[PDB]
C-alpha angles and dihedrals in degrees: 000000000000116000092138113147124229128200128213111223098174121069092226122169128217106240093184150014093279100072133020128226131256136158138225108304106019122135126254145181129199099233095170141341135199104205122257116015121053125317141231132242132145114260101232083206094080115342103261114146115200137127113297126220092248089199081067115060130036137194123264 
């Protein structure tokens, strides 16, 4: 029961081990979240799992 889709709209790039990088238009889950800091999803680009800026991307 949660096969929604998100969207990036921002070319951000991991600076560290904590996210992972995508550009605009890449597809996204929300696997998880914790509640209020970031998220985490798996990049479909190329695989890297890692926290996501959630003030970056959006639903669709």
């Amino acid at each position: 029961t949660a096969g929604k889709i998100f969207r990036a709209m921002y070319d951000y790039m991991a600076a560290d081990a904590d996210e992972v990088s995508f550009k605009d238009g890449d597809a996204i889950i929300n696997v998880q979240a914790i509640d209020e800091g970031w998220m985490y999803g798996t990049v479909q680009r190329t695989g890297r799992t890692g926290m996501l800026p959630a003030n970056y991307v959006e639903a669709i």
